[PDB]
Write a protein that binds this ligand. Sequence first.
Ligand code: SF4
Length: 66
Amino acid sequence: AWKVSVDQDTCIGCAICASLCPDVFEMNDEGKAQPKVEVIEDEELYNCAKEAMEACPVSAITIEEA
Ligand code: SF4
């Protein structure tokens, strides 16, 4: 399984990740992104999250596997 994280101090709230992968990322009350799910097992969701991670203009996204 995978766990996605968005570094709140780094995120600039550009919403690219939410646009690309709305099942995985949402905007919060600070105007930053955060994961809308605490675990991913669905390969489609992981693949999307991986593309968002690669696209983030400020490198705020990381994905942990276990
Ligand atoms: S793509 Fe990166 S900087 Fe933009 S909202 Fe998502 S985590 Fe934040």
